[PDB]
Structure formats: structure tokens, C-alpha cells
Design a protein around this ligand. Sequence first.
Ligand SMILES: [Mg+2]
Ligand SMILES: [Zn+2]
Length: 261
Amino acid sequence: MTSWRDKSAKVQVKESELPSSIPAQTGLTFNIWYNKWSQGFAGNTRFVSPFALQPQLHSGKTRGDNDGQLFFCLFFAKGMCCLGPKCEYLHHIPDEEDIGKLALRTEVLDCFGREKFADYREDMGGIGSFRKKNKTLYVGGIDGALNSKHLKPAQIESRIRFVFSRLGDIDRIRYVESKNCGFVKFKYQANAEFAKEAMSNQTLLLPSDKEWDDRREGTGLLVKWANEDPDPAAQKRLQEELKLESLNMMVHLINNNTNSA
RNA sequence: AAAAUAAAAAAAAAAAAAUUUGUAAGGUAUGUAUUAUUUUUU
Ligand SMILES: [Mg+2]
Ligand SMILES: [Zn+2]
């Protein structure tokens, strides 16, 4: 509105600043079918992103807004999009107005337009599932994100809270020191899908955090999906919210019978 | 009218043929595992 509705979206990265489509150097000879390096051993080829999303700075109106686009630019979520106001996808954070237009389609697609799959994955990776609506994002790689300096677990919790706060309605956050894991639950599926792409392979450390010069050498903070919550308080709370949303559609499933008569 | 040519001395010198060229397999096994404190809430 102040950020989005008045502005036009800017260009995060110029096309000459875009990274090379060739990966770095893993093996001896480059395979030109699969676009990978061959003949040797790979060396833990993950790396942190040189760019990132700036919600208030980079949002603005796009050509997807004028045409009626439902879906969001995934390169805008990564902080990489080079089209700016020419891009056919939306450059702003998903909100209650646009998510209301992602209603029939969001059952099988995500907010970027990618199909979901039946099984999840062995490591709970990229896209979601069309069987379970999972609104909670796992956070890992926090040691690799902080670039191996030490902090207190109370202060790690706040540094996770701030960068995730902009990406949508945060339901709850509970950083665990015993297992260095962040369980960040949102209000919406579409904001969990946006936040998973946006903060994947990023750095936690701030520009004043004394290692802002050296932060590119990391691995970034892993952002996968979260499993079911084993403590029995939330499971009863899961049983509660299952029952009350059921009765909400017990009302409307006898209204369209009342329309039927 | 028919013919349109009804024949030598008496035995001489002179040679040819044509072929088809290289590759892979049956031998040095096959199989398993291997960077992940890259930490999934009690
Ligand atoms: Mg045989
Ligand atoms: Zn874009």
C-alpha cells in the first residue's frame, strides 16, 4: 500500500549481475545434458545466497497486477528477479485479499504455481503435499547460518523472529537449544510457502554483527517442512481446531442442501 | 535363249583370359557401503 500499491517494483539484480548457469567446479568434465560436473567427488556443493528479499524496498506494482495474475514471482522471493515492473508475477508479500483469490487453485498448487506431490520427500524438501496442509516451517542449519560464532539461545530466538516476521502472520515461534531447531508456524499455507523459498540458503547475521564481510562463505539456514508435533498439549490442540473448523462447514453443508431443497 | 562368280600354285606365317585388403563381442568380475552434530517440538 504505502510500500506496494503506490510504487512500481524495482529490479533487484541486473541481467549482467545474474549468476552463471554453470555450477562451480565439482568434478573433472562438465556434462552438457544434465548440466552437472562429472568424474570425481562432489564437495558439499551447497552455498549461501549473495542476494536476499527486501520486503519494503522491493515491493511494487508489476505487470501481473494489471493482467490479473494469481501467482507470485519466485525470483522475487529469492531476491533475484531481473525484470522488475515487466515481470508477469506479483512482487509483494501474499495478503488476505490475494489469498482469497488463491482458494480453488491452492489445494493442488502452491503460491508460486507449482504442483504439489502425494508423498512428501525423504528429507521434507521443496514443494508441499496435496494430502496435508502444513503451515509450519522447520528451520535448520542455524550453526551454518550464524557462521559458527556463538550466541545465547534466547538471542537466537529473536534473530529468527525478526527476519521471519515480515513474511506474514507468524502464529508461533519456539527455538529449541537441545535440538538447534526452529518451528515457525504461520496463519496461512501461502505465507509458509512464500517464506520457505525466501529464507532458504540465507544468512542470519546482521550488517553490524562483525562478520558481515565474511558471511558468503557459509551454507545458509536450511528451511524444510515440519513434522507432526509430538508433545500431547498441541495434539489435543490439533484435535480442538479440527473439531471447530468441522462445525463451521457443518453449517455450510446444510445451507447448500437448503439451497437444494 | 541362258549366263551376270563356278577359279589355285598345291600348303605357309601369326596368341588372348587376373586375385581383393576391416570392425565389435566371447577376459581380466560382480555386489555392498561411503561428506550429513546439514540436530524435527514431548
Ligand atoms: Mg556362447
Ligand atoms: Zn519477477
